[PDB]
Amino acid sequence: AHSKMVPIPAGVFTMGTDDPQIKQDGEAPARRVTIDAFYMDAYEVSNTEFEKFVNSTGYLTEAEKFGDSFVFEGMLAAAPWWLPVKGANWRHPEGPDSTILHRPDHPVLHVSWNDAVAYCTWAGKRLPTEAEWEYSCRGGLHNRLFPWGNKLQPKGQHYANIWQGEFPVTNTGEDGFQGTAPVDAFPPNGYGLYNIVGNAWEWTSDWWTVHHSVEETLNPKGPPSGKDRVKKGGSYMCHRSYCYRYRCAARSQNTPDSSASNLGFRCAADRLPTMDS
Numbered sequence: 001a002h003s004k005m006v007p008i009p010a011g012v013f014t015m016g017t018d019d020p021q022i023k024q025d026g027e028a029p030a031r032r033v034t035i036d037a038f039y040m041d042a043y044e045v046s047n048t049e050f051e052k053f054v055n056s057t058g059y060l061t062e063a064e065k066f067g068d069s070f071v072f073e074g075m076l077a078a079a080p081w082w083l084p085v086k087g088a089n090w091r092h093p094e095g096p097d098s099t100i101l102h103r104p105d106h107p108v109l110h111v112s113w114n115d116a117v118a119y120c121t122w123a124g125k126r127l128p129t130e131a132e133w134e135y136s137c138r139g140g141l142h143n144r145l146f147p148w149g150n151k152l153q154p155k156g157q158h159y160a161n162i163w164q165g166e167f168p169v170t171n172t173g174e175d176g177f178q179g180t181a182p183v184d185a186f187p188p189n190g191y192g193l194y195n196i197v198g199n200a201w202e203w204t205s206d207w208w209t210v211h212h213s214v215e216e217t218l219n220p221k222g223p224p225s226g227k228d229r230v231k232k233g234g235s236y237m238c239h240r241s242y243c244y245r246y247r248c249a250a251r252s253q254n255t256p257d258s259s260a261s262n263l264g265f266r267c268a269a270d271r272l273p274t275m276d277s
């Protein structure tokens with residue numbers, strides 16, 4: 001049931017942080033946000049779920065139409081380790097000779113913001129807003145680094161799929177996965193969400209800004225205009241040493257037509273969509 005959703009309860013939470021770790025990203029100021037009750041996908045959208053959508057609609061993703069997408073060099077641009085690879089896309093995540101046949105339950109990758117909106121709308125859903133996403137990530141805890149608390153490895157256990165070792169030379173796979181993990185891997189957070197931090201980055205519906213006010217808001221949607229859309233949660237590539245973005249308060253951005261080997265999504269909805277019998 002990798003398309004199942006969980007009810008996210010109505011509430012008020014502190015979005016952002018007054019102790020930002022990447023100040024340039026507008027993690028600050030902390031602000032009180034009220035969110036109405038809604039539903040969030042328990043899992044990142046998987047390759048199998050995305051294939052159902054493509055089978056139904058014939059949808060060609062933007063990476064397939066452009067002919068290329070960004071791949072991390074270690075698995076074969078914003079950084080030397082990001083390469084535009086011809087023929088890399090959701091069915092071929094590291095280029096034309098790679099395949100998804102052995103990883104049907106891993107998160108779909110190389111999906112743009114437009115691809116994600118197409119999928120979620122086809123499913124009777126939508127992308128979450130940044131505030132909905134962050135509220136859900138926090139899993140009912142207040143002002144914590146991670147969905148589960150402040151310790152990276154609570155009780156000596158790995159709680160998310162990120163990088164271990166010296167990036168980018170060595171990824172030890174200590175957490176069990178060098179690349180992606182199945183969408184149902186690792187513990188759920190307090191709302192029942194899996195891999196909300198780590199694994200694949202996750203698109204949200206908001207336009208990106210770094211300028212936020214301390215005023216209290218209700219179901220905020222982000223700025224009315226922009227050039228980049230917000231992504232959240234970090235990925236299997238993140239490490240404290242260079243990309244400390246597997247925190248709920250963290251945030252990044254990309255143009256809506258862009259795609260990469262560490263970027264996926266999950267859907268949300270005001271109410272349960274029609275039962276998929």
Ligand SMILES: *[C@@H]1O[C@H](CO)[C@@H](O)[C@H](O)[C@H]1NC(C)=O
Binds near residue numbers: 051052055
């Ligand atoms: C998509 O269609 C192909 C061809 O009919 C089929 O083999 C495959 O199992 C389908 N995928 C899903 C997820 O239903």
Ligand SMILES: COC(=O)[C@H](CS)NC(C)=O
Binds near residue numbers: 072073075169179236
């Ligand atoms: C995310 O990619 C990796 O961890 C790869 C897998 S072969 N290893 C290196 C050293 O980059």
Ligand SMILES: [Ca+2]
Binds near residue numbers: 163164174175176236
């Ligand atoms: Ca890992």
Ligand SMILES: [Ca+2]
Binds near residue numbers: 044196199
């Ligand atoms: Ca994720």
Ligand SMILES: [Cu+]
Binds near residue numbers: 234244246
């Ligand atoms: Cu990161």
